[PDB]
Paper text:
VRC01-class broadly neutralizing HIV-1 antibodies have been isolated from several people living with HIV-1 infected by different HIV-1 viruses and bind a well-defined epitope within the CD4-binding site (CD4-BS) (1–6). Antibodies in this class are all derived from the pairing of VH1-2*02 heavy chains (HCs) with a limited number of light chains (LCs) expressing rare five-amino acid (5-aa) CDRL3s. Contrary to most other anti-CD4-BS antibodies, they recognize the CD4-BS primarily through their gene-encoded CDRH2 domains, although their CDRH3s also contribute to this interaction. Here, we employed a prime-boost immunization schema in the VRC01glHC mouse model that led to the isolation of a VRC01-like antibody whose κ8–30*01 LC had acquired a CDRL1 indel.
Numbering used by the authors:
A (entry chain B): 3 to 27, 27A, 27B, 32 to 207
B (entry chain A): 1 to 52, 52A, 53 to 82, 82A, 82B, 82C, 83 to 100, 100A, ...
Write the structure that this text describes.
């Protein structure tokens, strides 16, 4: 098994970044760069050789079972996942993301539409818009009863412009179960908030 | 140029088989091994084995040995990867790959575009589209609920509204159907006057829906 640490890393444009890969030997190393929806692209092979057209701000090094990929000055087009590879084995990868200032979620709640209720289902959407960093906690409360197991979350990739993330949480009930209660609330916890934010409505 | 072009997306039930094809052009086909690498959703790269098109000889990793079968058709310059007795965590994008040089097999300079294989017993179903109505910036959206398989596409106002749009990755529900939200933030003063319509395409079902989103 090969390993890369850390799994993700917040970087600032222009700074010097070092990505690490740990191998094991019982029988040299390549690096790939992958952006969303594309196939990986070979960057380094033979531990240190640059693939044709790779900028020389990328350097591969390696000693024993320890390999590094250094970017002397990270550029916007370097934001991607990097994988190391040795024969049949791949590291788990390291995603680069842009470090920016903390940004609190802007939180919005959406009751179920009448059109959905008419179909027999009720989904309540809690939208957490344009926050940073990615880590945030959504907690649904129904008539002040904390919920668990009846919601799912989805997060966008970092935005290209403002480097924020957005997150949706969707609480999904039956219509009969939704109609049994009054107060629907989503509570949001995040680093840019001094105390948790709650968005609620009475159906 | 070396070009590897793969077949289109597949949907298979658990226990079935899928066969993915990789057409290789722009070089002497029998001079290089063809590899197969897969990547489950949000996961890393996983090498599945290689074939030597010269006489069809193969090697597979232990994690797949009895389950994957690679073949080639030299006259059609195409490698094939068949994965049998499919399970849900075989859901993944499958790549064929080719090394930089006959010397070193493992420098994967060339990659196919990838083939998405979805393993599920769910049945093809178009989405229902419900409005996320807005309540000096407002949020509105569309809930694209209960569809199979991926993907759907969403635009707003026929592609004219793009700023502030967030279309989320779909979530897999316990039912085996997918569900997705798309939201957009707009000036609240535009709420009464400017119309906001989400356009949802689900081609596997030939579903096209427009939903006007009103206060």
């Amino acid at each position: 098994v090969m390993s890369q640490s850390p799994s993700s890393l917040a970087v600032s444009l222009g700074e010097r970044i070092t990505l690490s890969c740990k191998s094991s030997l019982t029988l040299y190393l390549a690096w790939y760069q992958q952006k969303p929806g594309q196939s990986p692209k070979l960057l380094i092979y033979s531990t240190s050789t640059r693939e044709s057209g790779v900028p020389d701000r990328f350097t591969g090094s390696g000693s024993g079972t320890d390999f590094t990929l250094t970017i002397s000055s990270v550029k916007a087009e370097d934001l991607a996942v990097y994988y190391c590879q040795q024969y049949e084995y791949f590291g788990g990868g390291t995603k680069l993301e842009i470090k920016r200032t903390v940004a609190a979620p802007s939180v919005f709640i959406f009751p179920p539409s009448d059109e959905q209720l008419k179909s027999g289902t009720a989904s309540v959407v809690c939208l957490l818009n344009n926050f940073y960093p990615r880590e945030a906690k959504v907690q649904w409360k129904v008539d002040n009863a904390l919920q668990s197991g009846n919601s799912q979350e989805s997060v966008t990739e970092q935005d290209s412009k403002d480097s924020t993330y957005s997150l949706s949480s969707t609480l999904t009930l039956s219509k009969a179960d939704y109609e049994k209660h009054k107060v629907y609330a989503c509570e949001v916890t995040h680093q840019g908030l001094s105390s948790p934010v709650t968005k609620s409505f009475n159906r | 140029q070396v070009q590897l072009v793969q077949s289109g997306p597949e949907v298979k039930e658990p226990g079935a088989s899928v066969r993915v094809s990789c057409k290789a052009t722009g070089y002497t086909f029998t001079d290089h091994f063809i590899h197969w690498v897969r990547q489950a959703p949000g996961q890393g790269l996983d090498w599945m084995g290689w074939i030597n098109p010269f006489r069809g000889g193969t090697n597979y990793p232990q994690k797949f040995q009895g389950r994957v079968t690679m073949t080639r058709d030299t006259s059609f310059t195409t490698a094939y990867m068949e994965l049998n007795r499919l399970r849900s965590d075989d859901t993944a994008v499958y790549f064929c790959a080719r090394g930089k040089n006959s010397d070193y097999n493992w420098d994967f300079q060339h990659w196919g575009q990838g083939t998405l294989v979805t393993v599920s017993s769910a049945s093809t179903k178009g989405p229902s589209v419900f409005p996320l109505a807005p309540s000096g910036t407002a949020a509105l959206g569309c809930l694209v609920k209960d569809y199979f398989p991926e993907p759907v596409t969403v635009s707003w106002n026929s592609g004219a509204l793009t700023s502030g749009v967030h279309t989320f990755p779909a979530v897999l529900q316990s039912s085996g159907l997918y569900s997705l939200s798309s939201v957009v933030t707009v000036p609240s003063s535009s709420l009464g006057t400017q119309t906001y319509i989400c356009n949802v395409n689900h081609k596997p079902s030939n579903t096209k829906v427009d939903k006007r989103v009103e206060p």
